[PDB]
Each structure stands twice: as structure tokens, then as C-alpha cells.
């Protein structure tokens, strides 16, 4: 049910 | 210790700061300091809020970071849902269930490297397809059936002591030109002491791999 979406900072750089 | 000392202690406290990559949109981002690393005090370990990621960055000697300020929130230093579940899958390899937003559930393998620090109810893992530190509060996905731990050749707890550990070590890589993937050694997991924690620079993840020089 985790999603790889949360998963890291959603702003990337 | 409750009583303080003149070094800012700032491990296990909420912070608040912008990040701003260069020439574009300042962010807002709070979260909590879980570690400083005593190769290098100027970083430090932190894990924001709605992100699973640990990410390693030098809070104070960074120009990316701005305002930063602690918050007088307190960590919820809480329940441990079994001291013995928790401990009887570290150093072992788990396959978590991911799904996606169309609903497409996947597998991710990976091993848990330890329990979180400040946080306890939170796990460090690793995957495979994906070598970097993330944080998860596994005692769930087991209990949904998200998370598989599988059998394996893993012995838990010369027999004398040996000097093994690779801390402090400067690493230096294969890049294709791209600079060169310089970094440093800054931590041995203590259930796996083949697996290590990398900090390279130009870089604020923590990656764990195997260092064995040799399969």
C-alpha cells in the first residue's frame, strides 16, 4: 500500500 | 542529559529551513535531524516530513539551505509494536509491496539494515534497484501483508576482532567523464559489516552498498 510516489522529495534537484 | 552544553546539540530536534536550487523556486521543508556523522560534523542526517528518503546535507556550510530554524516541536518518541518482530527481520532480505497510482502493485527486494535512530518505530532499509537510505515504518507493511522476509544463508546475533571497518576511506569511480564519482565511507552497519553508508559530494543521498572489492 506504500507508494514510491512519497518516497523521495517530490521536487527533484 | 536534559541540561544543555555550549555546542548546539541538534540531533533528535525538528528543524525548518528553504531550500533553493540555483536560480529557481525557494521550497519549504521541515523535519527531523536523526544523525551527525563524526567523520564530518557538518553533516547531518535528516528525514522530511511526507518523505521516505534520509537525505544527507550540510545543514550549516550549505548555500542551498536557508532560514534554518529549530522548531520547539517534539519528536513523538513512542510504543515499539514488538521489540522482538522488529530485529528478527534486520539483516534479513524482504520483498515490499509498492503499488502505483494506476494500482499496479510491484515488488522491490531489499534488506533492512537496522532500526531508525530518534525514530524508533521506523526502519532502515535498502533496495537493490534502488542502493540509497530510505525510512519506513515496516511493522506495518507486515502486518497488511505488504512485506515478505525469506530464509536465507544470513547468520544473526577468526572469532577474534578484526580491523575491518572502512570508515573514513575516500572513494573515486568509473564515471563516464560526468566529473568523477569522488566520495567517503561514514558508516558500518552493524548487522551486515560488508554493507557501508557513502556520502559522495554533489549529492545529498545516502547510499548503502557492499564493499567486498570483489563480489
Sequence with gaps: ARTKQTARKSTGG | ?215
Excluded at chain 2, 8 to 36: A, Y
Excluded at chain 2, 107 to 136: C, H, Q, S
Design chain 2, 1 to 215: 542529559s536534559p541540561v544543555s552544553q555550549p555546542r548546539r546539540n541538534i540531533v533528535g530536534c525538528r528543524i525548518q529551513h528553504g531550500w533553493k536550487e540555483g536560480n529557481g523556486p525557494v521550497t519549504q521543508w521541515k523535519g527531523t535531524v536523526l544523525d551527525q556523522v563524526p567523520v564530518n560534523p557538518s553533516l547531518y542526517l535528516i528525514k522530511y516530513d511526507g518523505f521516505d528518503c534520509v537525505y544527507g546535507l550540510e545543514l550549516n556550510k550549505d548555500e542551498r539551505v536557508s532560514a534554518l530554524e529549530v522548531l520547539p516541536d517534539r519528536v513523538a518518541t513512542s510504543r515499539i509494536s514488538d521489540a522482538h518482530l522488529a530485529d528478527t527481520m534486520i539483516g534479513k532480505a524482504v520483498e515490499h509491496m509498492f503499488e502505483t497510482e494506476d494500482g499496479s502493485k510491484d515488488e522491490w527486494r531489499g534488506m533492512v539494515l537496522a532500526r531508525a535512530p530518534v525514530m524508533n518505530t521506523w526502519f532502515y532499509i535498502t533496495y537493490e534497484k534502488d542502493p540509497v537510505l530510505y525510512m519506513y515504518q515496516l511493522l506495518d507493511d507486515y502486518k497488511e501483508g505488504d512485506l515478505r522476509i525469506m530464509p536465507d544463508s544470513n547468520d544473526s546475533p577468526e572469532p577474534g576482532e578484526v580491523v575491518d571497518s572502512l570508515v573514513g576511506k575516500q572513494v573515486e569511480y568509473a564515471k563516464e567523464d560526468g566529473s568523477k564519482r569522488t566520495g567517503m565511507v561514514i558508516h558500518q552497519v552493524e548487522a551486515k559489516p560488508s554493507v557501508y553508508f557513502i556520502k559522495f559530494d554533489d549529492d545529498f543521498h545516502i547510499y548503502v552498498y557492499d564493499l567486498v572489492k570483489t563480489s
